[PDB]
Amino acid sequence: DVCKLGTVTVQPAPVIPLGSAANISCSLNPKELILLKFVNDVLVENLDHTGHSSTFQVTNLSLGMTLFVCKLPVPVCGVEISVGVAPEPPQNISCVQEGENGTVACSWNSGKVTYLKTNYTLQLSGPNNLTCQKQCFSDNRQNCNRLDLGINLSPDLAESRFIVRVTAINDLGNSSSLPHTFTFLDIVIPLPPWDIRINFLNASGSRGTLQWEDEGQVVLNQLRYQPLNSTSWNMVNATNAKGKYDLRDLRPFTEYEFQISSKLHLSGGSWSNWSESLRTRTPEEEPVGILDIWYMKQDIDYDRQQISLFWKSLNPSEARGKILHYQVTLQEVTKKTTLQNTTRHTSWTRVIPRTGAWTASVSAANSKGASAPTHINIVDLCGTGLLAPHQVSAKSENMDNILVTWQPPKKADSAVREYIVEWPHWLRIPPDNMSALISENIKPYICYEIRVHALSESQGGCSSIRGDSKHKAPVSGPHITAITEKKERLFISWTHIPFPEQRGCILHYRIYWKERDSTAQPELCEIQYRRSQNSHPISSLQPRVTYVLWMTAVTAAGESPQGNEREFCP
Amino acid sequence: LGPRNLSCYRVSKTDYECSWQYDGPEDNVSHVLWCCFVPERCRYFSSGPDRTVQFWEQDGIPVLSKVNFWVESRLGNRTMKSQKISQYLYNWTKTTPPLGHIKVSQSHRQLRMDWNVSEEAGAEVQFRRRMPTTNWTLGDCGPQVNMSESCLCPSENMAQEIQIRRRRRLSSGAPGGPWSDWSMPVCVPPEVLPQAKIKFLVEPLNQGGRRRLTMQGQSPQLAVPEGCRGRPGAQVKKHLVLVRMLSCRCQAQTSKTVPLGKKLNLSGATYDLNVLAKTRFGRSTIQKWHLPAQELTETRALNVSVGGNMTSMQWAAQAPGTTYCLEWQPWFQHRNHTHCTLIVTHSWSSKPTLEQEECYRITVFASKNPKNPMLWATVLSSYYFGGNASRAGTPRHVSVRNQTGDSVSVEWTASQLSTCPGVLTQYVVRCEAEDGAWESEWLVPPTKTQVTLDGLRSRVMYKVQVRADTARLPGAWSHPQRFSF
Amino acid sequence: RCLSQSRNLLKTTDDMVKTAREKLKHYSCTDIDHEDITRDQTSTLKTCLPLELHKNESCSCLPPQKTSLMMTLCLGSIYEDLKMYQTEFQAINAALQNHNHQQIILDKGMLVAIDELMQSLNHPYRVKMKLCILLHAFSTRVVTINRVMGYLSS
Amino acid sequence: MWELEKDVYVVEVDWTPDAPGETVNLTCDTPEEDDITWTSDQRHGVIGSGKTLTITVKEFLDAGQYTCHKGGETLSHSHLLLHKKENGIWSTEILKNFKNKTFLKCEAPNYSGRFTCSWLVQRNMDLKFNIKSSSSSPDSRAVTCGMASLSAEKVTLDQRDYEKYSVSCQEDVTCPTAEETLPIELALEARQQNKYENYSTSFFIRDIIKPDPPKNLQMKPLSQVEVSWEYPDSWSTPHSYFSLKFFVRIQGAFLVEKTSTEVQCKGGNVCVQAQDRYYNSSCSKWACVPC
Numbered sequence A: 001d002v003c004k005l006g007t008v009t010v011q012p013a014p015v016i017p018l019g020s021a022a023n024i025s026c027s028l029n030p031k032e033l034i035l036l037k038f039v040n041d042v043l044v045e046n047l048d049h050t051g052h053s054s055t056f057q058v059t060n061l062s063l064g065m066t067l068f069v070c071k072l073p074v075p076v077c078g079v080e081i082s083v084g085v086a087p088e089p090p091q092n093i094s095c096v097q098e099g100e101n102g103t104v105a106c107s108w109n110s111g112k113v114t115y116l117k118t119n120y121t122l123q124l125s126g127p128n129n130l131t132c133q134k135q136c137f138s139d140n141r142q143n144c145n146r147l148d149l150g151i152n153l154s155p156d157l158a159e160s161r162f163i164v165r166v167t168a169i170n171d172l173g174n175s176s177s178l179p180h181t182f183t184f185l186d187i188v189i190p191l192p193p194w195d196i197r198i199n200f201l202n203a204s205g206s207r208g209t210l211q212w213e214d215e216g217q218v219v220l221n222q223l224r225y226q227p228l229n230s231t232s233w234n235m236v237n238a239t240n241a242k243g244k245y246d247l248r249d250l251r252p253f254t255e256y257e258f259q260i261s262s263k264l265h266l267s268g269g270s271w272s273n274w275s276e277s278l279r280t281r282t283p284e285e286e287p288v289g290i291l292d293i294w295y296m297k298q299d300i301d302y303d304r305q306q307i308s309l310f311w312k313s314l315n316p317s318e319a320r321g322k323i324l325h326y327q328v329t330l331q332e333v334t335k336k337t338t339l340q341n342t343t344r345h346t347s348w349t350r351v352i353p354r355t356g357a358w359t360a361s362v363s364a365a366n367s368k369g370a371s372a373p374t375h376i377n378i379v380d381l382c383g384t385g386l387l388a389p390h391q392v393s394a395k396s397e398n399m400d401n402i403l404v405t406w407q408p409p410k411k412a413d414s415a416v417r418e419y420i421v422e423w424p425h426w427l428r429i430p431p432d433n434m435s436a437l438i439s440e441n442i443k444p445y446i447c448y449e450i451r452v453h454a455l456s457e458s459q460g461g462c463s464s465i466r467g468d469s470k471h472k473a474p475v476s477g478p479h480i481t482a483i484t485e486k487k488e489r490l491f492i493s494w495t496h497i498p499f500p501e502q503r504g505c506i507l508h509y510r511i512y513w514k515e516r517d518s519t520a521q522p523e524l525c526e527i528q529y530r531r532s533q534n535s536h537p538i539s540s541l542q543p544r545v546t547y548v549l550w551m552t553a554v555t556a557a558g559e560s561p562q563g564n565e566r567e568f569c570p
Numbered sequence B: 001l002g003p004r005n006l007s008c009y010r011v012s013k014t015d016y017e018c019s020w021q022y023d024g025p026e027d028n029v030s031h032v033l034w035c036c037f038v039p040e041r042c043r044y045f046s047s048g049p050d051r052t053v054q055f056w057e058q059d060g061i062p063v064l065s066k067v068n069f070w071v072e073s074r075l076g077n078r079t080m081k082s083q084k085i086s087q088y089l090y091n092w093t094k095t096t097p098p099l100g101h102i103k104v105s106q107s108h109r110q111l112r113m114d115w116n117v118s119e120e121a122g123a124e125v126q127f128r129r130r131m132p133t134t135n136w137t138l139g140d141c142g143p144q145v146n147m148s149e150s151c152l153c154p155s156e157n158m159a160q161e162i163q164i165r166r167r168r169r170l171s172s173g174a175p176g177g178p179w180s181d182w183s184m185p186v187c188v189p190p191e192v193l194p195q196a197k198i199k200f201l202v203e204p205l206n207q208g209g210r211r212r213l214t215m216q217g218q219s220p221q222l223a224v225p226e227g228c229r230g231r232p233g234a235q236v237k238k239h240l241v242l243v244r245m246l247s248c249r250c251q252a253q254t255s256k257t258v259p260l261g262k263k264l265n266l267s268g269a270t271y272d273l274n275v276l277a278k279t280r281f282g283r284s285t286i287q288k289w290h291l292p293a294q295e296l297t298e299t300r301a302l303n304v305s306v307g308g309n310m311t312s313m314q315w316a317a318q319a320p321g322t323t324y325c326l327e328w329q330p331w332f333q334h335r336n337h338t339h340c341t342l343i344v345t346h347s348w349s350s351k352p353t354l355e356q357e358e359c360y361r362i363t364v365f366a367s368k369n370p371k372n373p374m375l376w377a378t379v380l381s382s383y384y385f386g387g388n389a390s391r392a393g394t395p396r397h398v399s400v401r402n403q404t405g406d407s408v409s410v411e412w413t414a415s416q417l418s419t420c421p422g423v424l425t426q427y428v429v430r431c432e433a434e435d436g437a438w439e440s441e442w443l444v445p446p447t448k449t450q451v452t453l454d455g456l457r458s459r460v461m462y463k464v465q466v467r468a469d470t471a472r473l474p475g476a477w478s479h480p481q482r483f484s485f
Numbered sequence C: 001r002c003l004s005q006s007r008n009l010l011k012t013t014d015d016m017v018k019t020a021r022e023k024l025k026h027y028s029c030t031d032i033d034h035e036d037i038t039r040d041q042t043s044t045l046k047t048c049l050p051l052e053l054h055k056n057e058s059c060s061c062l063p064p065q066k067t068s069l070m071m072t073l074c075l076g077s078i079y080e081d082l083k084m085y086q087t088e089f090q091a092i093n094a095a096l097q098n099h100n101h102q103q104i105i106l107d108k109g110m111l112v113a114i115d116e117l118m119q120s121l122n123h124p125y126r127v128k129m130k131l132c133i134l135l136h137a138f139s140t141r142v143v144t145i146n147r148v149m150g151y152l153s154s
Numbered sequence D: 001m002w003e004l005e006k007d008v009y010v011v012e013v014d015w016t017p018d019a020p021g022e023t024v025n026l027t028c029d030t031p032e033e034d035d036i037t038w039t040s041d042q043r044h045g046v047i048g049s050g051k052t053l054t055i056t057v058k059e060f061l062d063a064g065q066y067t068c069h070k071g072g073e074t075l076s077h078s079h080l081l082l083h084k085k086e087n088g089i090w091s092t093e094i095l096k097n098f099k100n101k102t103f104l105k106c107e108a109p110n111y112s113g114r115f116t117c118s119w120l121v122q123r124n125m126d127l128k129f130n131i132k133s134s135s136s137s138p139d140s141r142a143v144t145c146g147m148a149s150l151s152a153e154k155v156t157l158d159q160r161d162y163e164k165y166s167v168s169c170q171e172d173v174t175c176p177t178a179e180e181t182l183p184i185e186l187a188l189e190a191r192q193q194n195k196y197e198n199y200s201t202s203f204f205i206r207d208i209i210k211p212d213p214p215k216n217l218q219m220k221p222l223s224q225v226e227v228s229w230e231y232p233d234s235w236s237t238p239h240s241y242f243s244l245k246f247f248v249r250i251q252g253a254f255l256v257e258k259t260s261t262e263v264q265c266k267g268g269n270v271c272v273q274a275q276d277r278y279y280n281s282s283c284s285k286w287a288c289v290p291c
């Protein structure tokens, strides 16, 4: 052979259990002796008449494969030694079938590794003389944690209860398991249905039909269907749908995820895995909402007065879907005349003779047609003051909220049946409601105007007032531009102070004047702010004495600092 | 006086040596020594002014016996002798210093010096290290284990020098022969090099979009002693630079190593400049420089065609037959997606990276050999706005403030296309009275966000609409604002 | 030709030898212990020589230009020598898989290579020690085959 | 304790301070039996009386020339050498290893049965060399080559340069072989001032080949550029049964076997090596032309 330098022998066997003892003898052919010990070909252990026959005892062999070599430095000989354990009795057997067309698959726990070549046998027995057997080789690289037997018995015969066995053989000690009993019904898992497709019916996004192809003997199916609005997925069951279902009452214009699973029998078979997700778009549905249309009445002339038409659609019940076309149409009430136009934007203008009343209608034309023609009667912007309510009030307890409370009109509150409010942008309020809550499209630190029209067929009342949600002290005040003296009266004229420094609505002005030589409190005059005024009068002062003039702009929540100074000697 | 400190010892196998020191004049003095063998027989030697007496096993010296030695110095009419000694020749042997270039490795305040020794027996190892300013300092290496021998030293921040030496000890843990002499001195360079500012040249690029770099030649000076020569411990072995062109990464990574101080040809792109110095350990420190990318003012024509599954962009190159690389990089985004191709038109599949509304940098580089940075030319890196520009061309928040009784001020915020340079041409603002008998349009430069509307009839209700216009298509009309006075 | 097969087989033998050198650090794979098994027939060392190197007469793939009456002895000797080689690599290949030891895999490179050469030309622990000594001799052998075949073909 | 050459005796002595030497008996090769005068060269005067004298050798003073003499006539003389031993390790101090820890470095230029061997001595005062094939088995390959202690170019090491002594040896075989089975084994006998040394080595001649660099280097720019070389005449014949493989290096690069490769210069010299195409033998020294 190859060991021409002698021989080596081990006792008792080349294969050894863990923790045992071995007697090793190294001999040489007639006419020092060291022993080298390895683990996984890794050197961690190291060590003439006596050399003719050397006997030694080696113990405490670590778990694995060891190389023990006798070397005189010329090698003498060697043996390769393997240690291990008998396989453990396998536990937690679990066998799985996949649908109508699928062989028997199964899995088992092999426990800890013996670091040695082992093999495993799988045995299947059952009534009407059914049996099968297969083998699997397990080593340091391949693990037999699961095996397929390759035999597909008929799933129709679900009246036989079968037995599964798994057995382990190694060089040291054979291992087995319990003959596990199993019910044919439990093993089968049907495959999820395919050809899951969408058909649109009734010309509405709320109605549809789902079609699919699956084993015809399946008696139960389940469907998951959900949009992106909520994480919860919509559950529905079906008993013998036979591949077709009809879905009613769907929320339109929404992307949906659709999934389906199967169940062959109520007390047989098993569930099914989730199918491919259908990413579907829901078609549009023609809206039935009613949109209010707002107008302004600006008078160019008595025969060519200009009428504006404004509207805003902000909800997906009147602006649902791809809206592009706006067919606007105006009627004249007193005389039979109508006008039609097409608009894509929200504001539209037209010249009309002032005589007569009007009714303005607009449509919401989406993909499948237009919505109901929404129409509003048109009366004069302001009527009599008899229907004018008491001065309207406004309160802002929040930085992004305003409540408006109106007193009822001095005559009564029954003739009018609806109030419209604008600030322009518009809201509606019934007369029964005492106040109106508005918190949208408003920005504090800007002076606003609020207006309410009491909509009546004959003559609608009007009222308005200026106010703001939140205001602070103004940044600065205006300048004393011009001073004049006439008719023993002093007129002070200024310019319109720019918007950003007031930070809200200015309430009033306080003008302080004094003589130049007085260190006492300057005399004060109060001016209530109005937009139309630009000059203010004051009475005659002391003649031949110079006077110092200045002013501040005072709001409810603050006061502007002192502005410019004026010296006048009359 | 006279001879003193007699010491005979063994220089090498088949070799022996002896030495001593003299006290007195060097004029007309002779030095003679003896040896005697107790079998009596005696031998003698003399070398005059020279002190190194060499003798070995074939001159008749007794070597396996307690051989005795005495010395006599003769000058004028006087002779004087030193102390008699007697000992064994083999023992007390001088060993060999580490012969050849000792290998050294560096670590954080560690210097490992390993070498090979001819005699396999372990020996006491000692060293002395010197500063460029101070004298030597001694240190014992301690015991080691042995085929090789190693030593440890703390790493001083500047360059140092050090000499190594040994002595063969007895097996009884006692010194045998005296100290072997120090070997050739070895220099350790600084582990960190204090780098100064090297100077570079800046210039505008030409019409072709090309730049020339000539790195200035300068090297730092290291303070090293008189004996620190012939080794990179004195000064750095070589300086070097590395250029990285991080603009056309379609091909393999192309970073170029160049000797410091020579002509290089760079383009108008972003670059990484890395000035490095290779010591005996390798890369010590680095000087880092960044070159921001630029674009020539000369804008040349580009054609696009996007939509469907095929997106293709066309131009007229200077010369075909050479491979080009094209980059489509979103300027505003964090450049999470880098898109380029290596291929006058180029066509590719449509993907959701270039169809959105934002700036796309289209970079055209001409190349023939992806190994050198000279032949990459900045043809054009232009700005594109994908998708529908009318919606991005719609102004937002048009606010109009009354200035006088005839002049009013229209102001609006900048759109997205204002943040893409070189695309917007003008703004169209429309003034129409509500009667429809008076309509006018004004053109505003894109750099102005404000205009003053004039020539207005009082007591007439007014509607204003603004647009933003690109060089290709008009913008969309904004929300009309209804103002009057 | 047989020539491409010869380079292929030489390259795969070099690869197998380098892998054996890497893996078998402590095994008898270095010292050399060079003991051939061809002592019985030695005409490979005797007949596989050039005709200009022939000085004393005492001691397909063949091109028609280089036709000789004594090169056929060399090719027959190589043929039989490689059949014995093939038979024993079948034994070591079968023996290296029966045990659990799988650290070393011997791919079929030399096996399929010598099989193609044959069809082209005509018509425990001891085991890895034997494999290494056979490969050690087989390297010098296969160099001899490639030398003589490159000579005869060109 | 044996006759190195006729009339020449060699012994081994335990070179250690605290153990005695070996006892050797010497006799005068003369039929006349009477008291005789034996004298050496290191020690003056006759140290022993009688034809048979015992000598305890412990040190090189006891080695050398021993002359048998009577009256005024030299009857005979004897040569005594020493073979030093260091604690179970044989002393090797006449020669010095190469860079590969090898005492004897031999190389063959081709498969002609001829080669050279080189070794490194430290001094040159009265040395003697002998090279022989230490053959035990009759079928072992044998050489019949002469001996030269010839000096050569003084080569250096990691210290001062030293003397290279070399021989040109040649093997002879009755009939050639396709390859060699038995290795080639050489024994060297060395002697300085009566210091005897035996050295031994074994090696195959197929693992020590260093071929020669090419002779004719032509340059044809082809645009392309091709360098042309040729295998040296100093090689086995033909060039087909034994072939060569070449490196290419410009001023870590590739290997080529065909004569003309189309590389392009980068302002640097281009050179080629010479290696056998089968074994990992020794590379030669490049002989080349820039570009």
Ligand SMILES: *[C@@H]1O[C@H](CO)[C@@H](O[C@@H]2O[C@H](CO)[C@@H](O[C@@H]3O[C@H](CO)[C@@H](O)[C@H](O)[C@@H]3O)[C@H](O)[C@H]2NC(C)=O)[C@H](O)[C@H]1NC(C)=O
Residues within 6 Å of the ligand: A344, B387, B388, B389, B390
């Ligand atoms: C950018 O997006 C729009 C959105 O559809 C693309 O089509 C454009 O659609 C608007 C719809 O209002 C068209 O406006 C129309 O203008 C005519 C002019 O007479 C008017 O009569 C209609 O009532 C309507 O207002 C607009 O013309 C149309 N644009 C084009 C080029 O046909 C548009 O194509 C998109 N642009 C790009 C570059 O993709």
Ligand SMILES: *[C@@H]1O[C@H](CO)[C@@H](O[C@@H]2O[C@H](CO)[C@@H](O)[C@H](O)[C@H]2NC(C)=O)[C@H](O)[C@H]1NC(C)=O
Residues within 6 Å of the ligand: D001, D002, D012, D083, D090, D134, D187, D198, D199
């Ligand atoms: C080679 O060297 C060895 C040892 O240096 C020599 O061995 C001695 O051989 C002689 C006979 O030739 C014996 O009588 C001695 O006993 C041997 N020495 C020892 C220590 O046993 C050998 O002679 C040398 N020459 C050859 C050719 O082998």
Ligand SMILES: *[C@@H]1O[C@H](CO)[C@@H](O)[C@H](O)[C@H]1NC(C)=O
Residues within 6 Å of the ligand: A173, A174
């Ligand atoms: C299993 O092991 C038992 C002893 O442990 C033995 O008697 C029996 O024959 C074994 N059976 C097989 C099939 O190996």
Ligand SMILES: *[C@@H]1O[C@H](CO)[C@@H](O)[C@H](O)[C@H]1NC(C)=O
Residues within 6 Å of the ligand: B087, B088, B089, B090, B091, B092, D017, D018
């Ligand atoms: C060397 O060895 C001798 C052995 O006899 C011993 O006496 C001596 O002390 C050793 N050392 C010296 C100092 O020579």
Ligand SMILES: *[C@@H]1O[C@H](CO)[C@@H](O)[C@H](O)[C@H]1NC(C)=O
Residues within 6 Å of the ligand: B102, B103, B114, B115, B116, B148
């Ligand atoms: C010592 O010799 C070994 C031999 O391989 C070499 O690798 C090493 O570089 C040498 N020098 C040392 C360890 O300093």
